[PDB]
Design a protein around this nucleic acid. Structure first.
Lengths: 65, 132, 189, 62, 138, 314
RNA sequence: ACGAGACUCUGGCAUGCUAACUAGUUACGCGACCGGUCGGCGUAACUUCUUAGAGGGACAAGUGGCGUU
């Protein structure tokens, strides 16, 4: 994934004795993918989901649809 | 060189502590239950997790796990914790008591109890380890 | 079907190894015919034991820069003088081959021991695998260096080295180097 | 020097200034009533028969 | 549709199409025992005296070969022949002597049923070959 | 009654078995779909040198075939693999004829129509398909279906109109008449994931059970309770006797057989060679069934073998 | 938390599925002595090969042993 989390721009600012050369790098946000960040979940992190609560059956309760 | 990374170990921990009720024992079903309960974004990873989880379930079917204790294990332990013998280990007919603790009991006037039996002290005071 | 090449009987072969046969297995179905099955056993500990002696010696005689990679000529050159010892002994050449090989392994080796003492090292017995491998390599080295600018012709000299080592006389390169090494080690005990 | 034979019982360790020898416990089949510890050389197997020349020549320990 | 399990040694692949026949075998428009180097002649001979002629009298086998090297073509032709024989003689007639012949195969050489997995290793820069690096200047 | 004992087992397997289809019309023909990616057929030779070995084995699978079921004719086989498809092997030319795949995930358990025209298949995507060779679409379950995995689906093999039951890991069961395939009954009550339910060939009752070990019968046409089968956890087999009044389930590695006559035990089964330090459980049985004649019991295991249980002869 | 790892590709993976004579694909009287080799020719064969998109497989889960188990 590290192939697609870098943005880079370059500029320079002027002193008389020398130039200050400014490279700007930014890491890309996975969370605001905007369809560019990978839709797929992060490889290492096993994206788990919150379990759902329900009543543990004690007496049979039957519904008709 | 088959030491499990903390990522797969932690995945097994969170799976068996959060979604244990849905997992099965078979590896070949285990990666399927893994992909049902959570999302593994790779294949090698899901076999990693499935293999370790089979290891944990084999370990629990063997017996206790030193570092792992879940609510289900808590209730099964409290089921296994309630072992009550028919006869109390404390209620006995004759118990030995030194003369000094007989004096201690008599100071409270409970020396009249019949279950106490005198045991004479040891011959000498040979109770210290040699110095050196 | 159960004999080597359809010519070398493997049923009434000699024991000849008491317990070194665990290293070299040429007395059962674990004995392939031709000394060529590709170098596929050199991928795990002790798979060399499965490999037949013939293939190992055929692979070995292909070194010294002038024999880098070319192996079919090695197979030809071993089958030649395999036939020579076979017809000079009249029986299955296995006994004479094994005799030559086991007479060449250096009985003991002077390994350098000690913190900084190089004036006295230890004479220790050599493992059968190291012994046989060194014996094969050193006799092949002698065969090669008896073939460059030498009136003898290669693919015939190794037959005489084999029969000489099987008998044990000191004319051979392999047993004489082994004996000089042995005497050096005996000095070192 | 006559050569006697030994059999490995359990591999003990690997020794050597650069590492060439194996310390292993051995038993004699001809005696059958005693076991010693030999620092043999080379790739020794588990149970292979070891050709020792003497019963009193031992090298350094550790 | 079809198995045609073929045979590969290194990069050299040989496939043996086997069908109902007289038992004779052809290798690339040619019978067997006329190989030019004729040093691996017994290597191609192997299967016939391993399993026996009584099993090689009812099947026509055609072998096609392609892949570099003298020896590399071999160790695959015989593997292809063996595995084609297993496939054909299993899918139709019986399974007991099938176990017998495959067991004989296994005890002689496991390579005759299952192929060699290991292949060439790619070369990385900075040296002549794959693992070897160039001489360091000093 | 039968004393259901084992004489000697036969090896030669390379993976577990998933379904055993024994047919009564053919005396020696039997299908077995095994999750080693194969189908196999044995002929009952009944010899002492070998207790019976297969005559032909077929391998064309892409993954571990989940369930199998025979058609009317024996020259063709239909198998649904763990890749989620369905395929029709032919036993004459040794090559396939039809390949019915519409799903994306594995078809966990297949079932067949009573009249050899409907293909049903329930996958892990909470989707059940049921189509025909003719092309008239019958049903695909899309909306307001099971909330989680559906592990099986079976027919009612009676001479009346079939009704299907759909059971899954989400603890709830559903029943649909295939004549309409409309929502009529959803049944609640299990304490675990459903994997193997068993319907009698009558279409009036159907035992529902799974990993829970708390099995309750759910009738196909009425939907009530009949019995409360309990025992050890993790049960993946249930089957009655069509020709008699027995019943048997595979509760874990062990096997529990009772009566549909009185629900009492006929013979407790326990076989093991005693070993000093052996900390592994005996071989595990996954599926149970009857012979083509009922005198012998088929027990499909997870240990690459199907145990045939016969009478002790004495 | 970064790094290690997982991750990507790569030989093992069509033993089943996406299917072009332009590269290859047993069937099809001729040519050859009269029944067996030409890659020059003919079921537009419903792709096993080397041509590849999906899917699958292996995980120290199997066993034995060692380990403060």
């Amino acid at each position: 994934p590290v192939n697609y989390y870098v943005d880079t721009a370059v500029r320079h600012v002027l002193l008389r004795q020398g130039v200050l050369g400014i490279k700007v790098k930014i890491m890309l946000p996975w969370d605001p993918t905007g369809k560019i960040g990978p839709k797929k979940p992060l490889p290492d992190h096993v994206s788990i989901v919150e379990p759902k609560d329900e009543i543990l059956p004690t007496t049979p309760i039957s519904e008709q649809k | 060189g088959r030491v499990r990374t903390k990522t797969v170990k932690k995945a097994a921990r969170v799976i068996i502590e959060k979604y244990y009720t849905r997992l099965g024992n078979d590896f070949h079903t285990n990666k399927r239950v893994c992909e049902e309960i959570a999302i593994i974004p790779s294949k090698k990873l899901r076999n990693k997790i499935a293999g370790y989880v089979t290891h944990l379930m084999k370990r629990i079917q063997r017996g206790p796990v030193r570092g792992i204790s879940i609510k289900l294990q808590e209730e099964e332990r409290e089921r296994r914790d309630n072992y009550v013998p028919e006869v109390s280990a404390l209620d006995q007919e004759i118990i030995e008591v030194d003369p000094d603790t007989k004096e201690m009991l008599k100071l409270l006037d409970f020396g009249s109890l019949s279950n106490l039996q005198v045991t004479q002290p040891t011959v000498g005071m040979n109770f210290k380890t040699p110095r050196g | 079907d159960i004999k080597l090449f359809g010519k070398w009987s493997t049923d009434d072969v000699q024991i000849n190894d008491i317990s070194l046969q665990d290293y070299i297995a040429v007395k059962e179905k674990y004995a392939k015919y031709l000394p060529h099955s590709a170098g596929r056993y050199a991928a795990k500990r002790f798979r060399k034991a499965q490999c037949p002696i013939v293939e190992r010696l055929t692979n070995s005689m292909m070194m010294h820069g002038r024999n880098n990679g070319k192996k079919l000529m090695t197979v030809r050159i071993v089958k030649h003088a395999f036939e020579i010892i076979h017809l000079l002994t009249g029986e299955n050449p296995l006994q004479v081959l094994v005799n030559a090989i086991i007479n060449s392994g250096p009985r003991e080796d002077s390994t350098r021991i000690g913190r900084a003492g190089t004036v006295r090292r230890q004479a220790v017995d050599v493992s059968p695998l190291r012994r046989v491998n060194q014996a094969i390599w050193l006799l092949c080295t002698g065969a090669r260096e008896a073939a460059f600018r030498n009136i003898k012709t290669i693919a015939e000299c190794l037959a005489d080295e084999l029969i000489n080592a099987a008998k044990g006389s000191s004319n051979s390169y392999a047993i004489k180097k082994k004996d000089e090494l042995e005497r050096v080690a005996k000095s070192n005990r | 020097q006559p050569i006697k034979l030994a059999r490995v019982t359990k591999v003990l360790g690997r020794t050597g200034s650069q590492g060439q020898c194996t310390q292993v416990r051995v038993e004699f089949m001809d005696d059958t009533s005693r076991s010693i510890i030999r620092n043999v050389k080379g790739p020794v197997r588990e149970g292979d028969v070891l050709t020792l020349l003497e019963s009193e020549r031992e090298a350094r320990r550790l | 549709q079809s198995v045609q399990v073929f045979g590969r040694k290194k990069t050299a692949t040989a496939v043996a199409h086997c069908k109902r026949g007289n038992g004779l075998i052809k290798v690339n428009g040619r019978p067997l025992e006329m190989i030019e180097p004729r040093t691996l002649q017994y290597k191609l001979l192997e299967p016939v005296l391993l399993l026996g002629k009584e099993r090689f009298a009812g099947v026509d086998i055609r072998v096609r070969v392609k892949g570099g090297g003298h020896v590399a073509q071999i160790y695959a032709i015989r593997q292809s022949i063996s595995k084609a024989l297993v496939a054909y003689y299993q899918k139709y007639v019986d399974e007991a002597s099938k176990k017998e012949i495959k067991d004989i195969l296994i005890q002689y050489d496991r390579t005759l049923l299952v192929a060699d997995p290991r292949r060439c290793e790619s070369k990385k820069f900075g040296g002549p070959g794959a693992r070897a690096r160039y001489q360091k200047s000093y | 009654t039968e004393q259901m004992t084992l004489r000697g087992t036969l090896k030669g397997h390379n993976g577990w078995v998933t379904q055993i289809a024994t047919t009564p019309q053919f005396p020696d023909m039997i299908l077995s779909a095994s999750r080693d990616k194969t189908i196999i057929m044995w002929k009952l030779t009944r010899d002492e040198t070998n207790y019976g070995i297969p005559q032909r084995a077929l391998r064309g699978h892409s993954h571990f075939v989940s369930d199998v079921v025979i058609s009317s004719d024996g020259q063709f086989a239909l198998s649904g693999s763990w890749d989620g498809t369905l395929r029709l092997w032919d036993l004459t030319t040794g090559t396939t004829t039809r390949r019915f795949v519409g799903h994306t995930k594995d078809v966990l358990s297949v079932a067949f129509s009573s009249d050899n025209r409907q293909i049903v298949s329930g996958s892990r995507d909470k989707t059940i398909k049921l189509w025909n060779t003719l092309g008239v679409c019958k049903y695909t379950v899309q909306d307001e279906s099971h909330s989680e995995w559906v592990s099986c689906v079976r027919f009612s093999p009676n001479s009346s109109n079939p009704i299907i039951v759909s059971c899954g890991w989400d603890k709830l069961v559903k029943v649909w008449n295939l004549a309409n395939c409309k929502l009529k009954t959803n049944h609640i009550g299990h304490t675990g994931y459903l994997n193997t339910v068993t319907v009698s060939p009558d279409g009036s009752l159907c035992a529902s059970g799974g990993k829970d070990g708390q099995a309750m019968l759910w009738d196909l046409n009425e939907g009530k309770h009949l019995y409360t089968l309990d025992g050890g956890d993790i049960i993946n087999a249930l089957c009655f006797s069509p020709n008699r009044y027995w019943l048997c389930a595979a509760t874990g590695p062990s096997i529990k057989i009772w009566d549909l006559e009185g629900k009492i035990i006929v013979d407790e089964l326990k076989q093991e060679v005693i070993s000093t330090s052996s900390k592994a459980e005996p071989p595990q049985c996954t599926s149970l069934a009857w012979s083509a004649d009922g005198q012998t019991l088929f027990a499909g295991y997870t240990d690459n073998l199907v145990r045939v249980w016969q009478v002790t002869i004495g």
